[PDB]
């Protein structure tokens, strides 16, 4: 019986996790949902608690804490431990009844909860790519100290890569470890991209695209920030750095490939040049499920892939002139140090400015480039606590520098 | 160091094996070629012996035995054990200095050498699919007796399938063992086919096709028998039965898919509905190499797959009306017993009649169909020597029956 906590259970990752858990549990009792954690969605959490009956409930916002206590009195034969804030989150991570934690929260609370899950030697199913890009050095150090802790990737391309690896090799190492690629015989990665809504657009058309164009009739309905990142291909840029950190693959050995059908989710070339790929319909339930079942798989009732119906799969190179965010991501990754932290923070601001019609498409990459050029490399702190503060200071600095650049030109 | 014997070293499989061994050994000394076995080509064997310097040389034809001995006196600092016939082959299989044996011979010598390899508890890299289709029951029985022997698939689609499996699971079972699919969490197989030279012909066009049409402007350098089987899609029919026996996959869970680009070599759907596939250029060096490195991989200098250049991958269902041999293979497999033995034997005759311009395209499937209808199921011998005799007698009967049907409706 797999004992799982869901952090951010009313978000997209959290609700997809509970859906696949429900469906798999109908086939065979595999999962025990031990904890649910949300920001402020009391009614939604109450409804989840009535179905899954977790041992723990937690809610960040303290003004709806007593409302939650009163709601759960309506549930028959059920006496949960009801907690609140960061202290509740810490108590959940330290519980001996929890084996695996799905991190479905963004920004700092994602990183903070990941930190606590690692400190308690848990399996961490991590969907927040920005935390790996920004704080990769810190997570790597924490994983070296807490030897039984593991990060298992949920980001679909990185789940795909992970699924292409031989678990007889994977089990000798773990993600975010030096020498991961060597142990797994990895030569090179094909990192698949949908390409977003702008692949056929000219440079002159790209000059005038708006956030409405990027968000209009999405093929897959996902959040605004990632949709804008998909449009600029900064999503893939961030994912290149994520690949480097998770799998210890050199930047020269990561190739972005535009695959508009989104059936092949990524591919791994091994040292003999054989290539393995993972395929399914574009659906987050498979990557989430594998993060919770690894190193095994369990039965689902998901729709089987019909390759004859799919019929055609296509691949092409992305144009770096048209999608300069990709180039900037590689440059930041290759330069190393805290340049990925700066890239991520400056993109957070630029993405949001574009979303709100404050800047143009190529201003996104212009601002990111300028902030990157404004940063000086820093000696990397050997001390774990100093290193986290260093990352947070640089993050804050880069957001401010991006905002100042905007303000001056405006 | 991996100690290898090559049976049929001057055929297509043998020459590909020695090429990839040579190239891999230039990067790192991995392989010792301990034995080479050929039918007739004494001169070619001498040249191989001069380069590879194997401890054993064997030749099936006794009339060129003395010539080989005299030739080898030319090689400096070299004193091999020089053998001939079935006896020489048995002696090679029984050597404690040999770990892995590549079976690149067909027909009787192929089944015969496979048997002796298994009896001596070797790893057997098996490229002769006809042995598995005709003698699957016997090979299963033999592998149950000889617990440390293993068949590793070399046939490209079956190697692909094998490469899509997690070795943490594969190492708890072995090919041709009951429950192989259950242990590996296999739900379904996509068995990829080139479609062959007649794939786009109308029914009227198919009625007239000749063997010269099948053999003309061939895309890859392979033998006449398999080229004719590719044209009729009986190659894939045989490979369906091969999949069933190697992997214990039910016939209803094997789907033939026409993939004309021959980049994806086959795919495995797991019980969660995630699909894994193996990809490379159509080149037999990868499947051969993997059979000799499994459960590891080693470095090659093969050309890396350029997915952007490949650009497009396509998939469609084959027409059973145009390719009735596929339907016959499923029917024979599903019926079970020795019907696969009869299918293989009757196809051997019908393929050869068509190759030599004695019958038409649809006569191939007609003869096979009639022979299958003439066969009565038999009680399966419990004794392994009786079982081998039973298989061989059914094989002879079915070839004779096919020939007599040809002679009647001449
Ligand atoms: C909604 O579920 C899925 C599952 C798999 C694939 C897709 C297609 C969308 C792919 C990515 C979003 C992403 O980064 N993901 C999902 O990780 C968009 P781009 O950066 O253009 O490539 C959707
Ligand atoms: C020359 O080497 C390779 C290597 C991989 C793939 C191909 C393409 C030819 C595929 C098969 C032959 C076969 O049965 N093989 C190779 O196992 C033909 P059909 O039955 O139409 O599908 C060639
Ligand atoms: Mn992704
Ligand atoms: Mn084949």
From Swiss-Prot, chains A, B:
Record: residues binding NADP(+): 10-13, 39-41, 130, 223
GO BP annotation list: isopentenyl diphosphate biosynthetic process, methylerythritol 4-phosphate pathway involved in terpenoid biosynthetic process
EC code(s) of this entry: 1.1.1.267
Main location: plastid
Cofactor: record remark: Binds 1 divalent cation per subunit. Mg(2+) or Mn(2+).
Superkingdom of origin organism: Eukaryota
Places the protein is found: Plastid, Apicoplast
Record-listed 1-deoxy-D-xylulose 5-phosphate binding positions: 129, 156-157, 194, 217, 230, 235-236, 239
Disulfide bonds: none
Pathway membership, UniProt: Isoprenoid biosynthesis; isopentenyl diphosphate biosynthesis via DXP pathway; isopentenyl diphosphate from 1-deoxy-D-xylulose 5-phosphate: step 1/6
Catalytic activity: 2-C-methyl-D-erythritol 4-phosphate + NADP(+) = 1-deoxy-D-xylulose 5-phosphate + NADPH + H(+)
GO molecular function, one term: manganese ion binding
Enzyme class: oxidoreductase
Reported regulation of activity: Inhibited by fosmidomycin and its derivatives.
Function summary: Catalyzes the NADPH-dependent rearrangement and reduction of 1-deoxy-D-xylulose-5-phosphate (DXP) to 2-C-methyl-D-erythritol 4-phosphate (MEP).
Protein's name in the database: 1-deoxy-D-xylulose 5-phosphate reductoisomerase, apicoplastic
Organism whose genome encodes this protein: Plasmodium falciparum (isolate 3D7)
Lineage: Eukaryota, Sar, Alveolata, Apicomplexa, Aconoidasida
Residues of the full protein shown: 77 to 486 of 488
């Amino acid at each position: 019986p797999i004992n799982v906590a869901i952090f951010g259970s009313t978000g997209s990752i959290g609700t997809n996790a509970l859906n696949i858990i429900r469906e798999c549990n109908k086939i065979e009792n595999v999962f025990n949902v031990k904890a649910l954690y949300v920001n402020k969605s009391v009614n939604e959490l109450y409804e989840q608690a009535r179905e899954f009956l977790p041992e723990y409930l937690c809610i960040h916002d303290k003004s709806v804490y007593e409302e939650l206590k009163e709601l759960v009195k309506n549930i028959k034969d059920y006496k949960p431990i009801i907690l609140c804030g960061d202290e509740g989150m810490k108590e959940i991570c330290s519980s001996n009844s929890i084996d695996k934690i799905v991190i479905g929260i963004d920004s700092f609370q994602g990183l903070y909860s990941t930190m606590y899950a690692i400190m308690n030697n848990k399996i961490v199913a991590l969907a927040n790519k920005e935390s790996i890009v920004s704080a990769g050095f810190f997570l790597k150090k924490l994983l070296n100290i807490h030897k039984n802790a593991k990060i298992i990737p949920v980001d679909s391309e990185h789940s795909a890569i992970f699924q292409c690896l031989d678990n007889n090799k994977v089990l000798k190492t773990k993600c975010l470890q030096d020498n991961f690629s060597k142990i797994n015989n990895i030569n090179k990665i094909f990192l698949c991209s949908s390409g977003g809504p702008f692949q056929n657009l000219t440079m002159d058309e790209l000059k005038n695209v708006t956030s409405e164009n990027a968000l209009k009739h999405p093929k897959w309905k996902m959040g605004k920030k990632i949709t804008i990142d998909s449009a600029t291909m900064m999503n893939k840029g961030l994912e290149v750095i994520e690949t480097h950190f998770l799998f210890d693959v050199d930047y020269n050995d990561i190739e972005v490939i535009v695959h508009k059908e989104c059936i092949i989710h990524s591919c791994v070339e091994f040292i003999d040049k054989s290539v393995i790929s993972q395929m399914y319909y574009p659906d987050m339930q498979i990557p989430i499920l594998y993060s919770l079942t690894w190193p095994d798989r369990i039965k689902t009732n998901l729709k089987p892939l019909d390759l004859a119906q799919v019929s055609t799969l296509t691949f092409h190179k992305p144009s770096l002139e048209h999608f300069p965010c990709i180039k900037l991501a590689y440059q930041a990754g290759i330069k190393g140090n805290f340049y990925p932290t700066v890239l991520n923070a400056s993109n957070e601001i630029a993405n949001n400015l574009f979303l709100n019609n404050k800047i143009k498409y190529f201003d996104i990459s212009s601002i990111i480039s300028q902030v990157l050029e404004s940063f000086n490399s820093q000696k990397v702190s050997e001390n774990s606590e100093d290193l986290m503060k260093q990352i947070l200071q640089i993050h804050s600095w880069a957001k401010d520098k991006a905002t100042d650049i905007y303000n001056k030109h405006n």
